Amino acid sequence: VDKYTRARNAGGKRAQDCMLLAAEGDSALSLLRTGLTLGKSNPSGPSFDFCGMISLNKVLQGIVQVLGLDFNCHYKTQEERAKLRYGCIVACVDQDLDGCGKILGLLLAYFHLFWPQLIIHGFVKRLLTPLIRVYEKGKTMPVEFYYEQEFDAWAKKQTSLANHTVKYYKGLAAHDTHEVKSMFKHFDNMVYTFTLDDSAKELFHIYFGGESELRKRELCTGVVPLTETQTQSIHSVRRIPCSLHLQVDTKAYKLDAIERQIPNFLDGMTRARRKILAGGVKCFASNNRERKVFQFGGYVADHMFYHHGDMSLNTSIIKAAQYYPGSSHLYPVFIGIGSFGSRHLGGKDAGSPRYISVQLASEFIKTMFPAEDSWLLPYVFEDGQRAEPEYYVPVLPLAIMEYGANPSEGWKYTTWARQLEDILALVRAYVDKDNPKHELLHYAIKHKITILPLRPSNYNFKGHLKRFGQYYYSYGTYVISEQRNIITITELPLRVPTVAYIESIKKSSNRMTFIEEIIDYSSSETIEILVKLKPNSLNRIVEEFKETEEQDSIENFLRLRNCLHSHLNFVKPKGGIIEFNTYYEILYAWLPYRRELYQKRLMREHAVLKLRIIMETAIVRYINESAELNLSHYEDEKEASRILSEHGFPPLNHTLIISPEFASIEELNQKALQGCYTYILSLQARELLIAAKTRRVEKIKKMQARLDKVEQLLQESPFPGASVWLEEIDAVEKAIIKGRNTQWKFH
Amino acid sequence: VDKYTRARNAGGKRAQDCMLLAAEGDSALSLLRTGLTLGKSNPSGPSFDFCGMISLNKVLQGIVQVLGLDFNCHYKTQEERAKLRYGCIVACVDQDLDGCGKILGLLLAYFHLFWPQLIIHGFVKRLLTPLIRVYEKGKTMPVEFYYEQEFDAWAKKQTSLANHTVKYYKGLAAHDTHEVKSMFKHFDNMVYTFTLDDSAKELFHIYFGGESELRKRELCTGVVPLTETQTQSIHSVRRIPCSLHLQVDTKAYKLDAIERQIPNFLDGMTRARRKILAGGVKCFASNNRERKVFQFGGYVADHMFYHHGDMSLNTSIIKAAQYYPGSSHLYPVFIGIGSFGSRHLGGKDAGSPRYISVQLASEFIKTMFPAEDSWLLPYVFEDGQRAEPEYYVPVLPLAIMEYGANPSEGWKYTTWARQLEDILALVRAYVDKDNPKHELLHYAIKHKITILPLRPSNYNFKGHLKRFGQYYYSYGTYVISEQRNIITITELPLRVPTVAYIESIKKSSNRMTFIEEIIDYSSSETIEILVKLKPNSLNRIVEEFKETEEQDSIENFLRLRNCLHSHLNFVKPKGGIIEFNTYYEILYAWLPYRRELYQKRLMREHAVLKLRIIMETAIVRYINESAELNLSHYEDEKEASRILSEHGFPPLNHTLIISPEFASIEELNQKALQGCYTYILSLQARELLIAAKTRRVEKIKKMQARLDKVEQLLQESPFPGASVWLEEIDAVEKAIIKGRNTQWKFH
């Protein structure tokens, strides 16, 4: 066996007292070696006397060879279990879903499939290392939480976190030397035995069996965090049910694996694309100066917590800036300066990231993704730092607005962009109260039927879109020269690369028989392929390929027909996988999220306006009464605060009121009334004049007018923010038109 | 032929009028297609009528197949040349040294080797695209420079560059659409024919022949930029000699390729390591907070212009923070928090960059690499932006202070760290004027002989270092248990990974015969390997391996001896490759650079102190004379400046004097006397009081005292800055001792 360190007592008289520390990889093996050889100033801790190490079906073959397990044995009795070389096997995997969810899950499935009696009687354990450590100022011993729920509960009991620094250890390689010493000093109090319950068999069959339907049904919903009672019981008896592990960690790992290929139906982008968009918004906010692709990728990795390889990051950055006929992005996020790709190679002929540059399409991103609503979306947190939002909610349904296809395997995703005019008409009819077939559209939405039509986008396509049965076909255009006998292909079908199409024709002998030569003089955007045929071949070509209503004889000969198959599989905002049948369902699912976002924006604006009005009124009152109060004579802040409280001045938080970044409306109303009176003592000398008071009065008047406008907006029919939604739709349409006029180079 | 687009007239009556645009890759092919199909609003420009395209010995086989060249032909006559299908072949390669230096160089070598008459008579051309474009404000047409020397000469003639924006196009993929249109509008004025001269044959033989000695001799020196006369002649006759291209572009490409594996002898780090160190200094300057490896790599890529893959960046970041026995860095730049690697796998068992964190060893970096001297080193510029310095000059010879080895192939580099005490003694004896054997050391340096000894570092090595002949051998330590018959290896030789050593023993059958089992219970830092031998094997082992003075019988049996071979090949500061024989030569070469750096630091400090003294004296004079002058009554700045000039107030530059970042002493003395009188009108109201004047007088006194101290320092024997050098050496020694005491975790 390779990478196996046997214990001194393994396989001997005290073999049942031994342990086998199954390490995830090389880092886990290094940590285990450091802990086991630490037994110099550690009499109570473990050592190599009873603890062995191994690195994690050849690996499983080595595992069974070391443990001395028997395939034909059941280990239902103690005498049969005593033949094992080791008392128990302990898996040392990182707390991240990639390691504990996959490797430990596979090991548990293996053991359950072959030797379950070991699992029920107790043979498999796991190394539960502290997930989160909170260090105080002046206190050496930290507070350790094994789950994020426990840390959240503890932080709910903390008045302030200024004196506490929080460190997340999601991998075994994140533990420092003294932290490793601390964990291995209490090694016996940190191993957890796995147990089998009634639902464990069904969960194992679902997550590791050959039935894909059960797996898809189980993965339809999200991952539920462990209930505090379950966590408390686990910490109490030091036993972890297999069902809980399979339902939480394995499900999270599988959902994360799917989420890397399947986009959300609200914004149409995956996690990597959302990170790239957030990094682009943050990076180009100060100035829209051009930056190289690798520099922007480094910025995204540094700020947006993009821990994957830079190759995929650069590829996605290049794809987000591509703009050519048949490209994935009809409205790309970034303006690309340089050679970012051509339709002939399907965007695979892009320049090196060291040369091409990216810029933020501010006039489009600002309108499609409002900055005001960016403070209201739920954000994902990576090691306690605010990363990109969980999902973006654009003004228009960007999920169905662009060409989408999954190049990988394991999940089929393919969407064809719908027409901009049809989508705009549908959304405007839904939103506008004074619009034909508005009530009819709402009634149809309630009964889930379609009234207004949705058609595939015909932009950047000089072909023909036809409907046959329930399918949509795209036909390229060609012109034939009888005198020259050659055929000039002028337009390929939708999203058909030129080089791949030419090679596909060249790979067929039946078509190669009638074709003598193929030359590609197509421009960067316009296709022009000359196919020189053998003499006297038109009649033979017509006879070989009979003409039908579905397609022409030459169209069949040259394969100038493409089928628009759509696979509408998306990720729900609260986790899980959702399957749609038509784009109407996607639009109907996206609409309520945007309506709720508009309502939330209006409500938070109302709350912040009320707080600012209160602050300004208090400031004006203090300005008026400073002559009689004479607060400038006092020195201490406490005396001034007490006299202001006696006079009735309300206490407000300066920072939260003036900078309400990410505070929810209930949170904003909760913690804004426990501030101080700093806003009064911080007033400038020039601000005590009559002119400053008049300016503040004018500001109060304009803010009050905005408050009445917001209040009137909140009562708008059918839902609040309808006029704002229509205005933003008009702005987005204008930005899209301007981008299309200038080839998405806004100048 | 693949990726070949034939011209309409190629191989016909007008075949000699045709062209073959040899594209470097896919991006070049896309640019060529865009340019050639652009001929709609471009009657004068080229098109596919006479221009073909091809993608760049199978590729060369396709090239000769397309061109119809003959291997047995010489093409010495026009009639033989007329058989060619194309009139000429034009190479479209990016201006960067990777593309034009390698691919174009290989094509030129191919043509010279087989068909030189084509080269002399004129058959190979290159596409010379504008390297640098300067855009003015309000002027659409830019200024194009094909070489960096031309741009530098033009900028020397520019009074100000505020209205000019500079763009560098080092790749064919960096040209925008309108720029591509501009270049292809004047296509006939941008192709350059290659010519052969007398030295071309020798240069081709040197750079592409089988004689490695000639290549090494040629690469000993750096790359000389083309002289302005040569560039002017090239632009005049539109012909490029092959010798000039080989001497500049190919030499630069080869030197850059070598520089990625061979470190400088001044700081001991390559380009990537210098970029990482500069990024670490810049990133952790504000606060020394821990950052993840991938986040720091992204920061380095964004700011230090690291355009290579992130895998190598993360690997180098991890290596720079590793600290274990036998590691490459005896004094690592970064403190690593987490599991950064172990000696058992030779640092290959490091944790994932997503988990481990890095911090800047400020107490060591600040002392070893002074921040004051960081403004004086020559910096490399990447696309006009200031990247990491060309070379660092540490206080101590870091090139010989750490274990260095080149893991790649093509250049043999291996250095073994010398003892800290010996290096400190040598440098102190060189610097200190009152020191035994100081004059003797200087005399020996003049005669290039050694007096003080240099020995390999024995730190973190519980073995034996022995000297035999001119070689140094490292022996591990073992203990034998006769009763147990097993052998306990306690220390492996220097820089010998444990796993590799165990596998090497296991791979030999002769040693495997006497060994029954091998167990590795070694700690993270201490080696303890138990080798259980077969019964009655000590006598057989002794008989098989005879004992000699060089090594013991058991040492030969277990291969516990390592030879300390050193390959001292480095990169000179001004380019080229330098070969050393002993570490004394490296120290003697490094010393004058540090002495010159100290002298430059002292001189620039003197100049800036003089300028600041002049500024402060002028300010004090204005404060004294403001009562009579009454400058506050005036409104315009011009009138005040004129009256101050009449009164004799000197004009100084506020920004340059107060922030002399990277201004050389001659440059500082040149452009600091053409400023304005802003420093007088910008004075605060509170600064006109007597207390402010007294504070300024005290500041003037302290600055004058520092000026006299600097002046006395400049006259110090033997060279200026000797006491400063000794103080910095003492500080570096203290920092190294503190780091070694705390396992390079400064706390």
C-alpha B508: how far from chain center: 42
Contact B357 A174 (CB under 8 A): yes
A139 at interface of B, judged by CB pairs closer than 8 A:
no
Contact B337 A176 (CB under 8 A): yes
Quote the DSSP letter at residue A569.
Answer: E
Q: Is B60 helix (H, G, I), strand (E, B) or coil?
A: helix
Residue of B179, B289, B294 to mutate, interface with A, max A Cβ within 10 Å: B294
Specify whether A641 is located in the same domain as A535.
no
End-to-end CA distance of chain A: 66
Q: How far apart are CA B108 and CA B519, in angstroms?
A: 59
B352 at interface of A, judged by CB pairs closer than 8 A:
yes
Instruction: Quote the minimal CA–CA distance from B338 to chain A in Å.
Output: 4
Q: Who contacts B106 (Cβ-Cβ below 8 Å, separation ≥6)?
A: B208
B530 at interface of A, judged by CB pairs closer than 8 A:
no
Secondary structure E strands in A161-305: 164-168, 191-195, 239-241, 291-292
**Chain B environment of A170 (Cβ under 8 Å):** 355
Task: Select from B242, B258, B274 the last residue of a domain.
Answer: B258
Task: Select from B258, B279, B305 the last residue of a domain.
Answer: B258
Scanning A11-51, the segments in alpha helix (DSSP H) are: 26-36
Q: Which residue of B has its CA nearest to A745?
A: B177
What residues of B are annotated to the active site?
A: 355
**Chain A environment of B169 (Cβ under 8 Å):** 355
**Chain A environment of B48 (Cβ under 8 Å):** 521
Domain count, chain A: 4
Q: How far apart are CA B445 and CA B439, in angstroms?
A: 10
Specify whether B559 is located in the same domain as B600.
no
Concatenating the DSSP letter of every residue in B575-595 gives SSEEEESSHHHHHHHHHHHHH
Specify whether A480 is located in the same domain as A552.
yes
Concatenating the DSSP letter of every residue in B295-329 gives HHHHHHHHHS---S-HHHHHHHHHHHH--STT-S-
Question: Distance of CA A493 to CAs A59, A415, A498, A530, Å?
Answer: 49, 16, 10, 16
Residue B34: which of A29, A170, A524 has the nearest Cβ? A524
Specify whether B194 is located in the same domain as B110.
yes
Q: Which residue of A has its CA nearest to B51?
A: A521
What CATH number is given to the structural domain containing A645? 1.10.268.10
The response to whether B267 counts as a known ligand-binding position is: no
Specify whether B9 is located in the same domain as B108.
yes
Residue B469 forms part of a structural domain = yes
Residue of A484, A522, A524 to mutate, interface with B, max B Cβ within 10 Å: A524
Q: Are B90 and B191 in contact (CB under 8 A)?
A: yes
Q: How far apart are CA B533 and CA B401, in angstroms?
A: 40
Specify whether B554 is located in the same domain as B608.
no
What CATH number is given to the structural domain containing B48? 3.40.50.670
Task: Select from A519, A547, A563 the last residue of a domain.
Answer: A563
A30 at interface of B, judged by CB pairs closer than 8 A:
yes
Residue A111 burial by Cβ neighbours in a 10 Å radius (0-12, 13-18, 19+)? buried
Residue of B521, B532, B746 to mutate, interface with A, max A Cβ within 10 Å: B521
The response to whether B422 counts as a known ligand-binding position is: no
Question: Distance of CA A496 to CAs A192, A500, A502, B115, Å?
Answer: 55, 8, 10, 42
Question: Distance of CA A423 to CAs A297, A396, B379, Å?
Answer: 33, 8, 55
For the record, the structure tokens of A726 come out as: 């229509």
**Which residue in the block uniquely carries the two structure tokens 């020269």?**
A481
**Chain A environment of B350 (Cβ under 8 Å):** 27, 173
Closest among A612, A713, A724 to A668, alpha carbons compared: A612
**Chain B environment of A310 (Cβ under 8 Å):** 301, 309-311
Residue B610 forms part of a structural domain = yes
Q: Are B399 and B265 in contact (CB under 8 A)?
A: yes
Residue B67 forms part of a structural domain = yes
Residue B499 forms part of a structural domain = yes
Q: Are A227 and A153 in contact (CB under 8 A)?
A: no
Contact A524 B342 (CB under 8 A): no
A662 at interface of B, judged by CB pairs closer than 8 A:
no
Residue B117 forms part of a structural domain = yes
Q: Are B458 and B540 in contact (CB under 8 A)?
A: no
Q: Is the peptide bond before B651 cis (omega within 30 degrees of 0)?
A: no
Residue B326 forms part of a structural domain = no
How many Cβ pairs within 8 Å bridge chains A and B?
Answer: 175
Annotated binding site of A for Mg(2+): 24, 94, 96
Specify whether B606 is located in the same domain as B668.
yes
Residue A356: which of B33, B173, B300 has the nearest Cβ? B173
Cα atoms found within 13 Å of the Cα of residue A230, Cβ hemisphere only: 14
Question: Distance of CA B624 to CAs A714, B644, B694, B731, Å?
Answer: 66, 14, 12, 44
Residue B335 forms part of a structural domain = no
Q: Is B376 helix (H, G, I), strand (E, B) or coil?
A: coil
Q: Is the peptide bond before B116 cis (omega within 30 degrees of 0)?
A: no
Specify whether A108 is located in the same domain as A203.
yes
Q: Who contacts A593 (Cβ-Cβ below 8 Å, separation ≥6)?
A: A266, A393, A573
Residue B4 burial by Cβ neighbours in a 10 Å radius (0-12, 13-18, 19+)? middle
**Which residue in the block uniquely carries the two structure tokens 């109490």?**
A236
Domain, as residue range, for B636: 590-714
Q: How far apart are CA B534 and CA A380, in angstroms?
A: 61
What CATH number is given to the structural domain containing B531? 3.30.1360.40
Residue B27: which of A30, A311, A339 has the nearest Cβ? A339
**Which residue in the block uniquely carries the two structure tokens 């024919």?**
B193
Q: Are A122 and A191 in contact (CB under 8 A)?
A: no
Specify whether A552 is located in the same domain as A643.
no
β pairing state of A334-337 and A357-360:
antiparallel
Q: How far apart are CA B365 and CA B371, in angstroms?
A: 9
Specify whether B519 is located in the same domain as B603.
no
Specify whether B516 is located in the same domain as B604.
no
Q: Is A473 helix (H, G, I), strand (E, B) or coil?
A: strand
B295 at interface of A, judged by CB pairs closer than 8 A:
yes
Instruction: Quote the minimal CA–CA distance from A86 to chain B in Å.
Output: 18
Give the helix/strand (H/E) hosting A283: helix A271-283
DSSP bridge pairs for A389: A379
Residue of B354, B516, B520, B746 to mutate, interface with A, max A Cβ within 10 Å: B354
B48 at interface of A, judged by CB pairs closer than 8 A:
yes
Question: Distance of CA A167 to CAs A137, A147, A148, A249, Å?
Answer: 14, 13, 12, 21
Instruction: Quote the minimal CA–CA distance from A46 to chain B in Å.
Output: 13
Residue B151 forms part of a structural domain = no
Q: Are B396 and B726 in contact (CB under 8 A)?
A: no
Resolution for this PDB entry, in angstroms: 3.1
Specify whether A469 is located in the same domain as A554.
yes
Secondary structure E strands in A269-427: 291-292, 334-337, 357-360, 379-382, 385-389, 404-405, 414-415
Question: Distance of CA A733 to CAs A390, A395, A404, A428, A662, Å?
Answer: 26, 10, 21, 12, 29
**Chain B environment of A34 (Cβ under 8 Å):** 523-524
Q: Which residue of A has its CA nearest to B336?
A: A176
Q: How far apart are CA B73 and CA B71, in angstroms?
A: 6
